[PDB]
Amino acid sequence: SIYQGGNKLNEDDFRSHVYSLCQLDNVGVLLGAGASVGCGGKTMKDVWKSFKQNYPELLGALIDKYLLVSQIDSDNNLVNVELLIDEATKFLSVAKTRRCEDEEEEFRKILSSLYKEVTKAALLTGEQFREKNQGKKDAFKYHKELISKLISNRQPGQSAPAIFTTNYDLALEWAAEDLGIQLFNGFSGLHTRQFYPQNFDLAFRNVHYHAYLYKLHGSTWYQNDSLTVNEVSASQAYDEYINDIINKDDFYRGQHLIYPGANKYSHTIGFVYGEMFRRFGEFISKPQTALFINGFGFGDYHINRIILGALLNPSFHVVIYYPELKEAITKVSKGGGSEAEKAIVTLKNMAFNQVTVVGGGSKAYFNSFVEHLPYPVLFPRDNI
Amino acid sequence: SIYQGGNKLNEDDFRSHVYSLCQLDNVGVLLGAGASVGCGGKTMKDVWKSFKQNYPELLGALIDKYLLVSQIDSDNNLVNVELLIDEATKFLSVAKTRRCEDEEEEFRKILSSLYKEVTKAALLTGEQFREKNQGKKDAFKYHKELISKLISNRQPGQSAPAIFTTNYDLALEWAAEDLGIQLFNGFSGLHTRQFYPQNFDLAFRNVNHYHAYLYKLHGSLTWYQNDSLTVNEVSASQAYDEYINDIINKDDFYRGQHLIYPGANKYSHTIGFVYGEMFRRFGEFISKPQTALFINGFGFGDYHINRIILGALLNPSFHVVIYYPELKEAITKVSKGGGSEAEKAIVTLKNMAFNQVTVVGGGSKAYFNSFVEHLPYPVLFPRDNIVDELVEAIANLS
Amino acid sequence: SIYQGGNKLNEDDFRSHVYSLCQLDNVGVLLGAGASVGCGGKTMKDVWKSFKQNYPELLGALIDKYLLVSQIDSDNNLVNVELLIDEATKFLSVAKTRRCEDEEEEFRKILSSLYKEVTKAALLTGEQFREKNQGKKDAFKYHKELISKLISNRQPGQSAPAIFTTNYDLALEWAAEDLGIQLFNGFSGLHTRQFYPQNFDLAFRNVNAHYHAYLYKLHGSLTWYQNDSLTVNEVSASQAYDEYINDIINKDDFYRGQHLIYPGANKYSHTIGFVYGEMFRRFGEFISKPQTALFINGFGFGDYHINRIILGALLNPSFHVVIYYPELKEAITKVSKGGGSEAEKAIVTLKNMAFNQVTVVGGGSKAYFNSFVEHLPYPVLFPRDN
Amino acid sequence: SIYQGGNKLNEDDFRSHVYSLCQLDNVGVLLGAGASVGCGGKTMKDVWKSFKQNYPELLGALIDKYLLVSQIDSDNNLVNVELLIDEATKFLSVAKTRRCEDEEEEFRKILSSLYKEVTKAALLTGEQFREKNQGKKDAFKYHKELISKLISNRQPGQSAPAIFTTNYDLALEWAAEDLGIQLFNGFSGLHTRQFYPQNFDLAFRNVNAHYHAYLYKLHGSLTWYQNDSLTVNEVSASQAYDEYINDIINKDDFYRGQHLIYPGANKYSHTIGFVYGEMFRRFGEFISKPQTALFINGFGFGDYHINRIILGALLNPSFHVVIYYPELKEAITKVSKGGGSEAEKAIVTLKNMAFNQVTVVGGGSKAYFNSFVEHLPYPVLFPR
Ligand SMILES: NC(=O)c1ccc[n+]([C@@H]2O[C@@H](COP(=O)([O-])OP(=O)(O)OC[C@H]3O[C@@H](n4cnc5c(N)ncnc54)[C@H](O)[C@H]3O)[C@H](O)[C@H]2O)c1
Ligand SMILES: NC(=O)c1ccc[n+]([C@@H]2O[C@@H](COP(=O)([O-])OP(=O)(O)OC[C@H]3O[C@@H](n4cnc5c(N)ncnc54)[C@H](O)[C@H]3O)[C@H](O)[C@H]2O)c1
């Protein structure tokens, strides 16, 4: 179920590709919601579902007094939320310009509920989230495996693999804490954690099991209107700030920075995206590379662009896994497609056999991703 | 006229500093409004005056209906266009959402007026702007030689320099064409030019090469869109022929998402992308080691730049030379409790006890004309014009 | 059906030959004008047919009043307009020295209408020509691929492949745009885009290790027109459709150096300019060199310059030529008794030549341009032991 | 004497400049009919006088009926011989197509007169043309010595000199062949000797360190001919004198059709277009390479295209041109009266140009073969 250069590839060639690939100089992984679904995570679609099923007042006000969606479109489960927050800032700044002190109520209620659904669907474990004994659960059956498999396909004098994802929650950090592996996601210390580029370039020397981490959703990173961000336990941050977001139902000020909103200029100085995409750009600009994606929602405009440039590195055999790939092709054939859907279907249909895309379906899940990677052989020896 | 922390600067120190800079990763120069008078463009003051003198009847909406502006800011011209135009677009979008007709029409006409006034001086040529081979006029002569000095100091194999501009003029294209150099600016192609930001990470090689990275900061006349939000660029002729003239002198004729300037459509990710990416490349450029940054003759009318510089002081390789014609007057004004944001910002910046702070109070000497006049030229340097004579002689043959 | 050096060869051996050639030092293709015929183009014979059908009564009157070309000659489709245009300039210069004013109009009609027809057939699109989003057309599905196989079959320390052709159109920058490929065309700048041979010494590379490709267009181009400024400029083509195409088509003015395209027998008519002087020079620098192979689409071979040099260039073993020629049995039977045209004799010249260095292919559908495109096997990736 | 940049120069500086100019990667010499005036040659004015005297009547038909030239224009001797010949042939083709026998014969007579005038005076050997070993004549001895000066000054391992001629006679080649020197002008063979362009991209090598060079012919030759093959079949002069040239030159009236190739006759067909267009072409390729100098001697700049090429080369900022005019003083005197043609206007304007890149060496006798030979030095090792 692998397509490259407009032609199919066989299982033996797939295995040879994998075996050759594991030993390349550099390897990296990015993934969307191909795994968080099993763990119980919530995506933007679930945010829309909850907003539909819990808020009739604001949704009805939008439907008629603003006319920002139709019933059929909402039923189709395709409405956007990040652009909705952008237009919410538009409306509310217009109100603060002309000072309409009634609309402010509804729009700030919408923002409160929205950012609530954003920063309150990242737990996956209820109020147990702040407790201890987290990584040990077996619900990470395959997750943990991945990290292990990617710290054995190595030889002395090689850099650690780089990892990317779209996870709001901290599932993979939980697996790391379980396995005792030395991850890295920007900060150092316990009492004080401050952003520093230099902290992203730390490597260990045995006198090893480790790996890297980089979240697109980013922020345990709290800013109490102090122009700075710091990190401490989920339990402390819970006892301190988000407790007030439990039984108050008040307005949401942008104290601590999390960025699901598309219009970056809504927060013109957002400074967590830059590092993640600097890392991604560095990862593109190298031969002997590999990127995997599996049911990665092609919904970001800035993620469908660097990849088209990335195709111009041949040994960058960019990989795709998408069980529901029929929708994009069907839309392209008749009536055109969306923006990122068109971008990815254009990525695939580049004459190179380097571009590799998987649309197998039931076999494209995270289970295939974990199982396909084999374990290393220390001494191949002479096989003749 | 030049002071370095109360000290005196001589020719030897300047020559040593220039020589040290010439062997650095990046070398560049910057010019402000004072030195950009000759380019032929117009500032925000001209646009605001023309708007308030050509559509006085619409001053009510900015205050009497939406509070977009005050009177003191308008009285002393303390309004930055980008904010007002952005608010106009916000009101237009909300009017579209709310099916409001009168406000829609008012904002459409206001946008038309501001566009008509702003677009005037961006051509740099006028009626003959559509004509190809625009470099025939001598106005661009000064643009050519200087560019050479920005790259002539680079030895073979050295990293190419960069050029930064404040306004949205397009003199660099014609200057490079006259000199015969190409610049990578996202756009690329012949028929369907599109914006490749990966284009930055490229280089040339010799089988058996100097260039520069071109950045368009505050918009552009040649910028546009094609019915798909995809960013395209085209030579000046088609832009001045098809759509620009209609906008200028077609009365009531405006549309939706077709033009990208100045910082206009940020509520749409597609446009914003361009400015965000250019700023990202700038910000990660200063993160380089052994890099030289220049802030020359700048009024510091922006807020993000100053805060970014303050937060980026961790780099021990920051050197700044700024021209400021009138300093005693501004010091007196701020001391009494007056002054604008720019004056306060520059005064605070200059109050750092460092030996890298240089202040120039030569007045008109800060202008481009005076700077050119003061400089000498080599005897053997080619300054005379011979292409015109050769072309005339060739045409004379029959 | 398939021959190499006067003997018969099988398809598998030809495929092995192609695979072995692909790894040599130099690669490049000479897409015959007929390659663009499928892209909406037309041949010189089609131009003759159009010029006959648009002026039927006038053509008949000219034929029966001066008999430059007999009606039977056109009926059999054995007319060479390439000679006709040189004939026309000859006649009209003779008259202009004779000053006959009445005769100074029919030849104007013939020449200007021929130029209009050539340019119109070279547009390839028509009214939609100026509309953008070209590359999305499915027709280029092969042409597109043709330019992606010349960057994957190369490694560090190798030259930049170049593309020869005999086409009016610009259908190489179209794929370039559609795939972001830099097919260096020898031009610099955009606002005033002028050709410069010095641009034939630039190649792309990856700083942290990029792709590139060259361009060699023999048959001029529509965009290449000069106003007696002895210069050629490259501005867009949609920009053109309103500029001069309709204008000249709907102005009815005397002909001049309207745009630099060459229908006519005299190739050195360009005795004043340089274009003609910078599209063979490197051709000769190419075909004669160690580890070289000039690809061709095989039909006709009806020139006095390129083929003349091509045959004589074979004196060194490294050069190889692979061509297709289905017309083997019929042509052999016709030429066995009697003689043939210059082109037919030139092409059958190599039948007597037994050099394995030359190749010929046939078999009808097996000898199409699609076979040429598919005969560019993918570069070795993840090699293993079989 | 010598004027560079509008100022005179001394002998020492000129000698130093000439000595330093010998660092060229490739060396070539350009010649023509200008240098043959002082050795007893004939000019175009003599040719026109001979034509008018032999067959004056013809001058009428072309001059008045066909308007091939004005009466005063003809009297001024401003008709290009090859162009008039070619357009007479074009008239003949017109007559063949449209069957106007009167003009056909009236033009056959004119063409026969033209070839009787040019071919008869071009053999330059009389009855010795049919003889062999024509290189033993002492009349060319001086010329032979000049060749030594061009080859004796080149160190071993350097490129041998090249010879360019603007006329279309083999007298210089006959003189040079007496020394057993080999020249590559794209010809080879004995019994069917032909014209081959690949010779321009091939050369010999020495394994015991002898003489080689390239010759270029532009305006035709005394031999170049044809026989129903569209080729260039060069053979020994005696074959030609015994085959068809005998029947043409001295006979009362005789002319054949598509048989002759000179002095640029049938440019209305491809046959010669490839020849000339591939012999002057390489001359341009000589100036393509950077840092190469060209010398002009015995050439009157009789073609506007040559001035066009010179000016186009001058457009680049790294090109230098040296101009030799045998009759500069006469040209200045003639144009001082307000007359002169387009070529005279162009050359006078170029001379008046005040640039340091213009060098003029013209004093009448100083531009002749004898003065040119005397000015040049002799080899130091040559016995004296
Ligand atoms: N922190 C930053 O600076 C930054 C910068 C850019 C983008 N982002 C975030 O990065 C972008 C990531 O895109 P996302 O929101 O779609 O990621 P997500 O994991 O939160 O959501 C899953 C996405 O994948 C699609 N999908 C559906 N089924 C799937 C499956 N079985 N497997 C995988 N995907 C499936 C969904 O349509 C889509 O929601 C978000 O738009 C945005 O929240 C963050
Ligand atoms: N990619 C980017 O760099 C980027 C990012 C965000 C916005 N923008 C653009 O920025 C938005 C608006 O920016 P702007 O026009 O307000 O900035 P600006 O052009 O006004 O900043 C420079 C100005 O300062 C003035 N000035 C006053 N005193 C001066 C002095 N003493 N010396 C020099 N100059 C002096 C000058 O007239 C003028 O050059 C546009 O909407 C948008 O196009 C660009």
Ligand SMILES: NC(=O)c1ccc[n+]([C@@H]2O[C@@H](COP(=O)([O-])OP(=O)(O)OC[C@H]3O[C@@H](n4cnc5c(N)ncnc54)[C@H](O)[C@H]3O)[C@H](O)[C@H]2O)c1
């Ligand atoms: N300035 C320069 O660079 C320069 C120099 C020399 C010549 N030229 C020009 O170059 C010469 C090009 O010759 P031409 O264009 O007349 O050749 P052509 O188009 O007449 O011949 C090509 C051949 O391809 C055959 N064919 C039929 N079907 C085909 C198919 N499917 N694929 C491929 N071929 C098929 C056709 O029978 C035959 O026309 C012109 O004579 C001349 O105008 C230009």
Ligand SMILES: NC(=O)c1ccc[n+]([C@@H]2O[C@@H](COP(=O)([O-])OP(=O)(O)OC[C@H]3O[C@@H](n4cnc5c(N)ncnc54)[C@H](O)[C@H]3O)[C@H](O)[C@H]2O)c1
């Ligand atoms: N170089 C090319 O590529 C090319 C191509 C086509 C035609 N041609 C023409 O082909 C040749 C045939 O024409 P041609 O019959 O006149 O032969 P040619 O070489 O003798 O032409 C030069 C003419 O200049 C005249 N002249 C006047 N003043 C002179 C002076 N001071 N010194 C020397 N000559 C002086 C000569 O009488 C005469 O020789 C011409 O030389 C040349 O114009 C050249």
